């Protein structure tokens, strides 16, 4: 508070805090408010934040289907150390989880999975082409109202949130974090593609392919699957460990088929460079 919008329910509480659902009165539509504490200075609003937000606001103009819109932004409170900002996003009813949970599909489908990824990758090739990174791509981040639409949400918010996630960290769910962010903090664009593989696989299971906790926990848990990498493919924060090998696919799958397994590997390469792009992925044999 305050904002011309009238909150109406709570929709979740993730790393970016408590997400409410408001209605736009003079518009008679639904909204999805988040909030952020930003550092106030003697130079006012933080540059990279005001810049980051502004590029989010202008990104609507592209009208891409596979990504939610930032429709409005408002600084509600000023202190002298912090400014508070509410983000008004486009509202989408159920997340990808709620959509995989409420699945009276015991064990399918595979065209609803190939086309679902095809959108996933599109919206992700869109953001990447605008030098936007998500970095926290979750099933709770991926939306879809009645239509099977898929709106990617909460992309490009990590830097805007840097300050806040440091005063009071919260939660986590490293089940999707790439092996570079864990080891290091590569922040690059290929981290999203690693999160995309995990999601690819978790689709025809039904829960986290890499359900860990410790950053090392999550690691070995990964090396279990992809097998420990022989150098020089290593970077700079251990340190060495259980010498593992490349388990085949599909002792964590099926249902997966021929190429579908070969692609999930390209997405789950340890080497951020040899890793597949949303674009080269978005046109693999399997899709």
């Amino acid at each position: 508070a305050t904002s011309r919008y009238e909150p109406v329910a709570e929709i979740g509480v993730g790393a970016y805090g408590t997400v409410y659902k408001a209605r736009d009165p003079h518009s008679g539509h639904f909204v999805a408010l988040k909030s952020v504490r930003v550092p106030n200075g003697e130079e006012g609003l933080p540059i990279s934040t005001v810049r980051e937000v502004a590029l989010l606001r202008r990104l609507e103009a592209f009208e891409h289907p596979n990504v939610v819109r930032l429709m409005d932004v408002c600084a509600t409170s000023r202190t002298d150390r912090e400014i508070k900002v509410t983000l008004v996003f486009e509202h989408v009813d159920q997340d990808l989880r709620t959509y995989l949970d409420k699945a009276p599909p015991p064990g399918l489908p595979a065209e609803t999975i190939k086309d679902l990824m095809r959108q996933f990758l599109r919206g992700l090739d869109f953001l990447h082409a605008n030098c936007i990174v998500h970095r926290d791509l979750k099933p709770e981040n991926i939306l879809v109202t009645s239509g099977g639409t898929v709106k990617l949400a909460d992309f490009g918010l990590a830097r805007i949130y840097s300050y806040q996630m440091a005063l009071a960290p919260v939660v986590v769910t490293l089940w999707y974090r790439a092996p570079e962010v864990l080891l290091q903090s590569t922040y690059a664009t290929p981290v999203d593609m690693w999160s995309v593989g995990c999601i690819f696989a978790e689709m025809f299971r039904r829960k986290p392919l890499f359900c860990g906790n410790s950053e090392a926990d999550q690691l070995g848990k990964i090396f279990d699957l992809i097998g420990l990498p022989p150098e020089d493919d290593w970077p700079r924060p251990r340190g060495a460990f259980p010498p593992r090998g490349p388990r085949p696919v599909q002792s964590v799958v099926p249902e997966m088929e021929e190429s579908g397994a070969q692609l999930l590997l390209e997405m789950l390469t340890f080497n951020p460079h040899k890793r597949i792009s949303a674009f080269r992925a978005l046109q693999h044999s399997y899709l």
Binding site: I47, V50, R57, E60, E63, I83
Partner: protein, 246 residues
Amino acid sequence: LLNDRVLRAMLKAEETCAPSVSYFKCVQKEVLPSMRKIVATWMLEVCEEQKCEEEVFPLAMNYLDRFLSLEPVKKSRLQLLGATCMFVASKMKETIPLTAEKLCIYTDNSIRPEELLQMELLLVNKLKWNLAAMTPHDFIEHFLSKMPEAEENKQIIRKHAQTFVALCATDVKFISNPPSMVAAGSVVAAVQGLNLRSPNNFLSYYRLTRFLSRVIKCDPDCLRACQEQIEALLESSLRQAQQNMD
């Protein structure tokens, strides 16, 4: 290609950042065109003196006009608005932005860093943080990329066009005309003049109004009308350049 794809988006994004052509009649009670003229002029001298990015001043004038389209403003409060628009535009465009104190010094300390910082929050909120509107400089570069013309030639076009752009931002036209069109007209006025002095050299000049109004998705008669308004302005600048006596 991607040119068009992003171009269409930027042309749309532009419709969302459009000031009102009638805010002096419908929204402002105190602020008249002559006063926007005075403030614009002071804003330009600050950007020149501070060797700002070329696009800071035109962008700050977009903000100003957009704010005036939505909020009534006391004329005693206008210079603060303008200083705030420079502040925001600078932060948006510059490696090393203008400081709040530096801006205040430029008003002879008429305003204080605290007024400026309050006004920033107001400004940014009115505009819904839609601050990354594409700039006339942006369009100019795009047009130039589509043109066969040696680099040395584009460099001279660039210089002149940016003069026209800044000239427009001080005048009432900047309000009705979108940056894409102000940019187009400025390029046409530039290329056309250069080729007149140097035939056989600046030949993207031929029917350039037609060419650019397609790129810009606009009425060519509007562009020509625009370019003709730009060239009148540059002539009206015989007055200011001389009568600096009595």
